[PDB]
Design a protein around this ligand. Sequence first.
Ligand SMILES: [Zn+2]
Ligand SMILES: [Zn+2]
Length: 45
Amino acid sequence: GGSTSYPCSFKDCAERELVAVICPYCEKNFCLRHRHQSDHECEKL
Ligand SMILES: [Zn+2]
Ligand SMILES: [Zn+2]
């Protein structure tokens, strides 16, 4: 159809990359924008 990728799960997500970064505590795949401790607001910041 068009392109092939697997971005992170979020409503404010507007970035698509090959491999998403893995949080230290959340250990989840996310973009650089959300990767920010302030953006994600990880409880175990
Ligand atoms: Zn994202
Ligand atoms: Zn996190």
